[PDB]
Amino acid sequence: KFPRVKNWELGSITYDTLCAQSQQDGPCTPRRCLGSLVLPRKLPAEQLLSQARDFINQYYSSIKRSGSQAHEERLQEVEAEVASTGTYHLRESELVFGAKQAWRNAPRCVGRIQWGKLQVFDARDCSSAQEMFTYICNHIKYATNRGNLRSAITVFPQRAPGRGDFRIWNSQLVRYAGYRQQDGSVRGDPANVEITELCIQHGWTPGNGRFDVLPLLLQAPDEAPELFVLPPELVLEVPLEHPTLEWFAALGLRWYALPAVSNMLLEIGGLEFSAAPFSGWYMSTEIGTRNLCDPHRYNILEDVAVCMDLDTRTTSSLWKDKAAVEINLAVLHSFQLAKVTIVDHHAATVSFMKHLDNEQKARGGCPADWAWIVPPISGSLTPVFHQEMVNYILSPAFRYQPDPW
Amino acid sequence: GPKFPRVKNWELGSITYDTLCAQSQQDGPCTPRRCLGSLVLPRPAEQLLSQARDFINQYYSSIKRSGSQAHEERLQEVEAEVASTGTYHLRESELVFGAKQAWRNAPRCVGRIQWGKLQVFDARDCSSAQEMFTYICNHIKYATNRGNLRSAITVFPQRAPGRGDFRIWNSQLVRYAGYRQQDGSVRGDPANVEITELCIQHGWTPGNGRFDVLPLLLQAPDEAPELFVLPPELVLEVPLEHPTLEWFAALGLRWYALPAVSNMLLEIGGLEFSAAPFSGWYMSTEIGTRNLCDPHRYNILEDVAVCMDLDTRTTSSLWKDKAAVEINLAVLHSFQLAKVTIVDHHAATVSFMKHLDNEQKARGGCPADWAWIVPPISGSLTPVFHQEMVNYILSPAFRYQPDPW
Numbered sequence: 155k156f157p158r159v160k161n162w163e164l165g166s167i168t169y170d171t172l173c174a175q176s177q178q179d180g181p182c183t184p185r186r187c188l189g190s191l192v193l194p195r196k197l198p199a200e201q202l203l204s205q206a207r208d209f210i211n212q213y214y215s216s217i218k219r220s221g222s223q224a225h226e227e228r229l230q231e232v233e234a235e236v237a238s239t240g241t242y243h244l245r246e247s248e249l250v251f252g253a254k255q256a257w258r259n260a261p262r263c264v265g266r267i268q269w270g271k272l273q274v275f276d277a278r279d280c281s282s283a284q285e286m287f288t289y290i291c292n293h294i295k296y297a298t299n300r301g302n303l304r305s306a307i308t309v310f311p312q313r314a315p316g317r318g319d320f321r322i323w324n325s326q327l328v329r330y331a332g333y334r335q336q337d338g339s340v341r342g343d344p345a346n347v348e349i350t351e352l353c354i355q356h357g358w359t360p361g362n363g364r365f366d367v368l369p370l371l372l373q374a375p376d377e378a379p380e381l382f383v384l385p386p387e388l389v390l391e392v393p394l395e396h397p398t399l400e401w402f403a404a405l406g407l408r409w410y411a412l413p414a415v416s417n418m419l420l421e422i423g424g425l426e427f428s429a430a431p432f433s434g435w436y437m438s439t440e441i442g443t444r445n446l447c448d449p450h451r452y453n454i455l456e457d458v459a460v461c462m463d464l465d466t467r468t469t470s471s472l473w474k475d476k477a478a479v480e481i482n483l484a485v486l487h488s489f490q491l492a493k494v495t496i497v498d499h500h501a502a503t504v505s506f507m508k509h510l511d512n513e514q515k516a517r518g519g520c521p522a523d524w525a526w527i528v529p530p531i532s533g534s535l536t537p538v539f540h541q542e543m544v545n546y547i548l549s550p551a552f553r554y555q556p557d558p559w
Numbered sequence: 560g561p562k563f564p565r566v567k568n569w570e571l572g573s574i575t576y577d578t579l580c581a582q583s584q585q586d587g588p589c590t591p592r593r594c595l596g597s598l599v600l601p602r603p604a605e606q607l608l609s610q611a612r613d614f615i616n617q618y619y620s621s622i623k624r625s626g627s628q629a630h631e632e633r634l635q636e637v638e639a640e641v642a643s644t645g646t647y648h649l650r651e652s653e654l655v656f657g658a659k660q661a662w663r664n665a666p667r668c669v670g671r672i673q674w675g676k677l678q679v680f681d682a683r684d685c686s687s688a689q690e691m692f693t694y695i696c697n698h699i700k701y702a703t704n705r706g707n708l709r710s711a712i713t714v715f716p717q718r719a720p721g722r723g724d725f726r727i728w729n730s731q732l733v734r735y736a737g738y739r740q741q742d743g744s745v746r747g748d749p750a751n752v753e754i755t756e757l758c759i760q761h762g763w764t765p766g767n768g769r770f771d772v773l774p775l776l777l778q779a780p781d782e783a784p785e786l787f788v789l790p791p792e793l794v795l796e797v798p799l800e801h802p803t804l805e806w807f808a809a810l811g812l813r814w815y816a817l818p819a820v821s822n823m824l825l826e827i828g829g830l831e832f833s834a835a836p837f838s839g840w841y842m843s844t845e846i847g848t849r850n851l852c853d854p855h856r857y858n859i860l861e862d863v864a865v866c867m868d869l870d871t872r873t874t875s876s877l878w879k880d881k882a883a884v885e886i887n888l889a890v891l892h893s894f895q896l897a898k899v900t901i902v903d904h905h906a907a908t909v910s911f912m913k914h915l916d917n918e919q920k921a922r923g924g925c926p927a928d929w930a931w932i933v934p935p936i937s938g939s940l941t942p943v944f945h946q947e948m949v950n951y952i953l954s955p956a957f958r959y960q961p962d963p964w
């Protein structure tokens with residue numbers, strides 16, 4: 155039942171007992187493992203009531219008050235509310251606890267050592283796209299903090315039986331436009347072609363740069379989404395230069411400070427928050443490796459290799475591997491110079507190892523998706539490569555949800 | 560959609576469905592409730608007949624004679640043989656097919672584009688440990704072929720009803736000694752401390768270098784294992800140097816040419832071949848990244864970085880990343896110089912994508928273990944990182960088996 159989990163570098167073993175608490179099926183079966191798939195194929199009062207209770211039980215236990223008067227009364231409130239209305243509402247403190255727990259539970263997140271330090275903005279009294287914009291701006295300002303980045307989440311109104319969802323259409327709060335050219339290519343970020351086109355269509359005046367910050371498309375229930383331009387002074391950006399390579403700065407490369415996911419659903423106690431954007435700070439491989447070097451992203455390896463005068467003719471010269479290292483170094487150097495928070499993949503994975511150990515003591519296990527935890531360069535050079543990991547779904551949870559269009 | 564796993568490549572945006580996984584008869588370690596794909600080792604006449612019938616059906620399909628008199632007579636011959644004796648025997652071309660099929664089925668091997676090109680040495684007549692030695696030496700000579708390496712496998716007699724197994728105690732045909740020092744460190748390869756100490760226990764006179772080739776501990780049915788030293792002239796080795804860093808040759812690093820796994824079980828139609836070593840050629844990251852840079856192996860990252868004058872006191876200089884690239888380049892360069900076959904991780908993973916496409920057409924899928932297929936440096940720089948993979952067990956197969964001691 156309970157899996158033995160081994161670290162191969164140190165030869166140590168733990169047993170994951172926490173997985174017995176999963177109530178939600180992942181994609182694998184005994185016949186075949188599907189653990190490497192990015193998305194699940196997937197994309198009543200009795201059932202809401204029991205997730206509700208389980209979460210309230212979670213919360214009172216967290217404040218050591220299991221079984222107290224306050225606990226029993228709270229379970230009664232929840233039961234009374236569901237029975238009469240088919241739904242219920244969380245108290246602010248309960249929400250706060252749920253958001254941290256959803257982060258704690260996120261198997262794909264290597265930054266979870268930070269999970270206890272999360273500023274939570276209650277935006278549940280939001281009634282318009284306009285109000286959503288104000289809240290999003292205050293989040294960005296708080297989170298950014300002149301480069302001294304602070305983790306945060308802002309929670310818009312939950313989904314309801316009657317009506318359309320509150321949604322942020324953009325996948326992140328800051329995204330660069332991707333412009334489909336005649337010549338079939340893309341100018342800017344190819345990942346954001348579809349969102350750039352939705353923006354233009356809803357009336358945005360596009361640019362023609364490689365790094366034009368997109369406007370937000372915000373949707374109040376059952377209304378057309380609305381367009382809002384982020385004030386340039388709120389979007390902190392970092393020009394990329396290299397400590398020793400003078401020509402690198404010439405490339406004109408840059409990236410934003412704030413990684414803020416905005417298309418994911420936050421589930422707490424059976425309740426669903428379809429708009430609940432959250433941010434921390436970047437690990438440098440996200441920018442240096444994936445965003446700049448993925449062949450379907452900015453795909454800049456070749457340009458850099460040529461600048462370094464490397465032998466591009468053959469894979470055996472490891473030109474790809476050499477240019478990648480310098481691009482990652484440029485990202486770290488630049489963020490450090492500009493006094494904006496960043497973590498390298500060695501420091502991050504070492505702290506994830508400490509987190510694994512903390513969670514083993516605290517909860518008897520830690521859900522983790524090895525393919526997402528291990529960095530996209532220098533995998534086996536980090537300690538997580540050598541760590542077996544068990545993957546499963548615990549609730550509170552961040553989930554993927556359909557695109558609104 | 561089809562009710563088979565949908566599989567996506569996130570670089571090209573292309574989709575396939577794995578229908579091959581339907582043929583899987585053995586459960587792996589995952590369940591709906593938790594994924595265990597990252598674990599290295601996760602965990603009767605009627606049963607034999609049924610595996611035998613299935614393998615014979617595979618054989619006759621492969622020669623396009625499924626349904627024929629020859630097919631049903633072979634079936635008849637197999638069940639008669641199990642009826643009277645409890646076991647059965649494969650024809651020669653049946654063994655050749657099954658050996659190739661087991662390589663083809665190996666989810667952890669990125670080298671599978673070559674699967675059709677395997678020299679199968681039949682050693683099912685072997686009857687002593689001395690003869691095992693002769694066969695093994697012939698394998699190495701043929702496979703090594705003065706540096707122009709050729710894939711091969713040698714098959715020794717299968718497990719018999721209450722008769723002892725043929726076993727090769729060593730994990731590979733070529734391994735360096737690991738000597739546990741009286742200060743607690745290890746000289747040589749720490750992976751091989753146990754087998755080194757079994758070797759000495761059985762009367763081997765040990766050396767004291769970092770790169771002493773171990774002797775072979777060969778076990779014939781019901782006999783204690785016997786010890787055989789490989790004649791040095793049969794063990795091709797490559798001294799490591801760097802194309803531009805002149806001091807790298809002074810490190811006195813080296814590696815052997817021939818990777819030959821010798822502790823795996825080859826299972827075909829229920830029959831179990833406990834000694835059946837097989838060899839290919841190396842992918843460079845196995846040597847330059849894992850074998851040399853793993854903390855629990857040669858661990859040379861720090862030494863190399865010091866020679867390169869890197870800042871080894873801060874993670875954010877990427878000192879580990881820069882040293883690893885250079886050690887990897889040195890492995891490729893030294894092998895090329897010495898005319899000994901090797902393949903870099905770019906060329907290997909590209910060829911594996913081609914293999915994925917061939918197998919989609921030929922069998923409707925390909926079992927693949929993402930954590931093992933993705934190379935341990937430059938992960939997302941290779942096309943396999945962006946390819947979803949389905950993992951399941953098909954037979955014939957190579958399986959792990961308990962250590963003989």
Ligand code: HEM
Pocket residue numbers: 253257260262263264265266268272305306307415432433434435436437440497502526552
């Ligand atoms: C504090 C600094 C943080 C760091 C360095 C960090 C690090 C990372 C990294 C490297 C990834 C993989 C991302 C990718 O490949 O695109 C990730 C994923 C993720 N993180 Fe974090 N994280 C941080 C904070 C947070 C916070 C505050 C939350 C939510 C409260 C969070 C929840 C998640 C989730 C749900 C994923 C999976 C995203 C997806 O499926 O697309 N993380 N994290």
Ligand code: HEM
Pocket residue numbers: 658662665667668669670671673677710711712820837838839840841842845902907931957
């Ligand atoms: C032709 C050149 C070949 C290349 C480049 C190659 C490449 C590799 C690599 C890089 C691995 C992972 C090794 C590790 O991380 O320790 C591997 C594993 C494996 N390969 Fe190959 N391979 C080749 C030929 C073969 C052959 C000839 C066979 C058997 C007939 C084979 C069967 C296997 C098996 C069973 C594994 C998994 C072994 C384990 O779990 O330890 N491969 N291969």
Ligand SMILES: Cc1cc(N)nc(CCc2cc(C#N)cc(CCc3cc(C)cc(N)n3)c2)c1
Pocket residue numbers: 325326413414415432433434435436437440554
């Ligand atoms: C808080 C935080 C901090 C930090 N340092 N990094 C992150 C991860 C960022 C991330 C952004 C996007 C986007 N857009 C997609 C991903 C995953 C890729 C993806 C791709 C697709 C197609 C859908 C989907 N839901 N996700 C990750 C978050």
Ligand SMILES: Cc1cc(N)nc(CCc2cc(C#N)cc(CCc3cc(C)cc(N)n3)c2)c1
Pocket residue numbers: 599600730731818819820837838839840841842845959
């Ligand atoms: C034919 C061929 C070609 C090629 N390029 N590479 C290989 C496989 C390499 C490999 C070797 C060993 C060993 N010894 C162990 C492994 C597995 C790692 C391992 C390590 C330990 C300690 C235990 C265990 N069960 N498994 C892999 C084969």
Ligand SMILES: C[C@H](O)[C@H](O)[C@H]1CNc2nc(N)[nH]c(=O)c2N1
Pocket residue numbers: 190191192525526527569944945946947948
């Ligand atoms: C197909 C494969 O699962 C996919 O490329 C994953 C691999 N690992 C990852 N890991 C992280 N952190 N982020 C990613 O986007 C991915 N992509």
Ligand SMILES: C[C@H](O)[C@H](O)[C@H]1CNc2nc(N)[nH]c(=O)c2N1
Pocket residue numbers: 162539540541542543597598599930931932
């Ligand atoms: C814990 C993890 O499964 C383990 O370190 C795996 C990861 N991927 C690997 N991939 C290959 N090719 N070889 C290995 O030994 C490993 N080790």
Ligand SMILES: [Zn+2]
Pocket residue numbers: 182186187188189589590593594595596
């Ligand atoms: Zn799985």
